[PDB]
């Protein structure tokens, strides 16, 4: 218990997102090592969540929601929130 405390996560997808547009962030599991990463997005529409197992030792996550609103993005390592998880993420309607 508490492996997750050594795991860090950042990138634009844990800060802001646009509806229908993929939101990417990174998770660096160097210190905690290997384990089970469970990602949750909780909000007014269903997220599609993808992983990217990078050679750099980091893991990539991209998610897409379609409805603008306020989402919470959870990152658990071995079933336990990592620091600052849940992340509160505002998803806006796209521009352009």
């Amino acid at each position: 218990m508490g492996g997750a405390h050594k795991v860090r996560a950042g990138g634009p997808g844990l800060e802001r997102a646009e509806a229908g547009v993929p939101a990417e962030f990174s998770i660096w599991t160097r210190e905690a090592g290997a384990g089970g990463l469970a990602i949750a997005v909780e909000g007014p529409s269903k997220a599609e969540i993808s992983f990217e197992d990078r050679k750099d030792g980091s893991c990539g996550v991209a998610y897409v929601v379609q409805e603008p609103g306020d989402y919470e993005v959870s990152v658990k390592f071995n079933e336990e929130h990592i620091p600052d998880s849940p992340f509160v993420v505002p998803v806006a309607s796209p521009s352009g």
Binding site: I27, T29, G33, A34, G35, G36, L37, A38, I39, A40, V41, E42, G43, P44, S45, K46, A47, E48, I49, S50, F51, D53, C59
Partner: peptide
């Protein structure tokens, strides 16, 4: 209404 979507992956060593 509120949807919660969970996906799991195993970050390798």
């Amino acid at each position: 209404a509120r949807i919660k979507a969970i996906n799991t992956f195993f970050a390798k060593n």
